[PDB]
Amino acid sequence: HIDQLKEREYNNYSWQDLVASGVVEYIDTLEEETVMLAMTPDDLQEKEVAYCSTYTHCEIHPSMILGVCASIIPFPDHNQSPRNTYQSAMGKQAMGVYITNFHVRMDTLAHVLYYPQKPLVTTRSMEYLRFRELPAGINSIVAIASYTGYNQEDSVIMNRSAVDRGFFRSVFYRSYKEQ
Amino acid sequence: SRHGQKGTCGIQYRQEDMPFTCEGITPDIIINPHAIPSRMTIGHLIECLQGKVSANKGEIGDATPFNDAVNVQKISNLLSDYGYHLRGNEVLYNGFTGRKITSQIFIGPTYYQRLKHMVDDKIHSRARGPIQILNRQPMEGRSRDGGLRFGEMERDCQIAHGAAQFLRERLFEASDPYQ
Amino acid sequence: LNGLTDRDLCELNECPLDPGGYFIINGSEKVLIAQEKMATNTVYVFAKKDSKYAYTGEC
Amino acid sequence: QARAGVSQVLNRLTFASTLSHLRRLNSPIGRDGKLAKPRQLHNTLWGMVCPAETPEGHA
């Protein structure tokens, strides 16, 4: 199945064949209470002193428990959990290219960034969220220091020359209608 | 940032003024060290460390959450093959005097975002503008050209100050004087 | 805009990355938020202690 | 007398707010609720609902 599935889009093998062939299953929450689920497949289905040895399912990837805005945090497991919630919320204000035909939309209130970049360290599930095609942010050389005194309580210090060169410059669009 | 570290620009220094490493890499953004220890966003530092490996190797790092292959000894061993300190510190110089800073500063590339809360959409002032019609007090809202609200909690804090004249000016003479 | 290829989404001035899933109502995109509720057709024995009842078999 | 906010204006501010606005659920429990048990992350939302993305206001 891995090899046939690697050669999809070259012929026509897909997810529906994995479901029809009887390999994956849609288990849900009232039925999930009687599965015995393994988290990774090798490592929980190997042989030691026994934990259960009667597994009935196995997870595809454990990081598929995160949602859309939470799946763009890199290393969310090294963070204190309220911080991951704040980023889930602040990632929806990040300016960036919000859509590709943005010159045809006459939205009220659009913000687009001039020069958005792709993250240099990404998670693997921000491929499907199509984040490297419509990214929202710039990879900047941060320097955790305490320099003059101006960055002192949740404040930062930016480079004026970097900004002169177009760093996080953005454009704001407001639309008015009348008939 | 992508980890819950919000905060505003505090000042902007040119390039001659930012601190700089032994080649002229000045930071773009300098955040404060005190934002880290209480919030325990270690993922921020691991990302700033792997972004340096990624920009030196020349390909994009992986930060999927539960991953067993990546840890910090492994990133650190790679970083020291490009001739950096294995922990990401560098030796910066003062931009104003040129003298080395006796602490080695932790610098590397992190992906920042730019949130849509700019200041020039929040600055707001009033001195005798338009007025409501029912109770002839200033209008509300920044776009209506309103005035700020001197609510009740602000009035108890003025009673406790024993400030009877500022209290009757804010509640009579600068709001809705009549005879 | 359905089953329509990618040149044609762009010829109609659209983006091929748009997900879909929303309505246009007077030229506003509106989304329907999913609302949860209790499962129907199922017996649930609770216990409200703040009444005259020891138990309650809702359905 | 109806429900409200069942239909909201789609958020086109960045692609990740569009995508998350389209996959959003809603528990209808009112606000002005001093109870916690419907706001707690139940064990049973494992793999179904994101355990990190919630609004930090009163909702």
Binding site: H1, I2, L5, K6, R8, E9, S14, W15, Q16, L18, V24, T40, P41, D42, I60, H61, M64, V68, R124, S125, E127, Y128, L129 | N67, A69 | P19, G20, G21, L32, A34 | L19, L22, R23
Partner: peptide, 28 residues
């Protein structure tokens, strides 16, 4: 024949096939 420790490359092929077939807003 089974797939062992060559499995992070294979755990993500079935994820990519799932997201080709079903977008993200399929539930709508």
């Amino acid at each position: 024949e089974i797939t062992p420790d060559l499995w992070q490359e294979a755990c993500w092929i079935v994820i990519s096939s799932y997201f080709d077939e079903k977008g993200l807003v399929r539930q709508q």
